[PDB]
Write a protein that binds this ligand. Structure first.
Ligand SMILES: Nc1nc2c(ncn2[C@@H]2O[C@H](COP(=O)(O)OP(=O)(O)OP(=O)(O)O)[C@@H](O)[C@H]2O)c(=O)[nH]1
Length: 299
């Protein structure tokens, strides 16, 4: 049983779009300091923190306001966690709530036995410098609290998105990209994988990287993996890792051959003695095109 937690107004927009795409066998948790922003979440379970400290307003782009507001509500966080084997902390770094509360939600889930994954977006360079250093030094707090942290800088998204994209649809794509990271790993566990397998990939590895590839036509099984190995969302290239995870999602047409094909183009590009596993997701609503998702652990 897996549970997802959306810290901040950012992460909450992701959890909103995450069920808009329809996701199975993952229980949902939203967390916010703003009272009218958590009003809009579709999550099964909602929690507000810092009703004493913010009293309804957003935590006003201050990290410590979030950090101590979560300490105040330590109870309801412990409530929603226990009963879960794996915990996802999807939260947009930058704001007061996310940059302070999410590092706490994590370290609770870590010392509560469960597995801990941080799927966080860095902010744009177009949001000032002081907003960045917060988010970046908040990744620092995130880094040592979770098991693996999947940094997705939002500046890498400018290549995938248009030049014409406005402000409130530039984050619509960021929600979709945070979805691909969790859904990529979630759809594998609950022709499945062993859970104790992922324990070897994730446990106390550190900084992680994500790559996305989509291919349509004739030679889909290869053009996908190639575009995934050279995705802009990867800072470096995938060779550094001591462990790789691969998700191949395709429609009814997907052949057991195509999977082994794509898996070897990735295995070639990775280090020669790497920990690697992979799975096949049959998603009937997909027409002909498929999608490959790559995770790199331990640099
Ligand atoms: N995934 C995603 N990230 C967003 C979205 N909007 C903003 N962000 C990122 O998240 C950062 C902080 O925004 P919020 O999460 O809404 O702020 P907060 O965590 O609620 O903290 P406060 O400033 O106190 O409200 C920004 O710097 C953006 O980079 C969004 O709609 N989706």
């Amino acid at each position: 049983t897996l549970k997802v937690i959306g810290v901040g107004g950012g992460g909450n927009n992701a959890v909103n779009r995450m069920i808009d795409h329809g996701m199975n066998n993952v229980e949902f948790i939203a967390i916010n300091t703003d009272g009218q922003a958590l009003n809009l979440s579709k999550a099964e379970s909602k929690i507000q923190i810092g009703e004493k400290l913010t009293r309804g307003l957003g935590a006003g782009a201050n990290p410590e306001i979030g950090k101590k507001a979560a300490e105040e509500s330590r109870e309801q966080i412990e409530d929603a966690i226990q009963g879960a084997d794996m915990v996802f902390v999807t939260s947009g770094m930058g704001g007061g709530t996310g940059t302070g509360a999410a590092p706490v939600v994590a370290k609770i889930a870590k010392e509560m036995g469960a597995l801990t994954v941080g799927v966080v977006t860095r902010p744009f360079s177009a949001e000032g410098r002081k907003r960045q250093t917060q988010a970046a030094a908040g990744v620092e707090a995130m880094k040592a609290a979770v098991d693996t942290l999947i940094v997705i800088p939002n500046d890498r998204l400018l290549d995938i998105v248009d030049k014409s994209t406005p402000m409130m649809e530039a984050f619509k794509e960021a929600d979709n990209v945070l979805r691909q990271g969790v859904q990529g790993i979630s759809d594998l566990i609950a022709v499945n994988l062993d859970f104790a397998d992922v324990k070897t990939i994730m446990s106390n590895q550190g900084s992680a990287l994500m790559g996305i590839g989509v291919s349509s036509g004739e030679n889909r099984a290869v053009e996908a993996a190639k575009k995934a190995i050279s995705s802009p969302l990867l800072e470096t290239s995938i060779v550094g890792a001591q462990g790789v995870l691969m998700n191949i999602t395709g429609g009814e047409s997907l052949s057991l051959f195509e999977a082994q094909e794509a898996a070897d183009i990735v295995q070639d590009a990775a280090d020669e003695d790497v920990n690697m596993i992979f799975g096949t997701v049959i998603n009937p609503e997909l027409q002909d095109e498929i999608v490959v998702t790559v995770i790199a652990t331990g640099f």
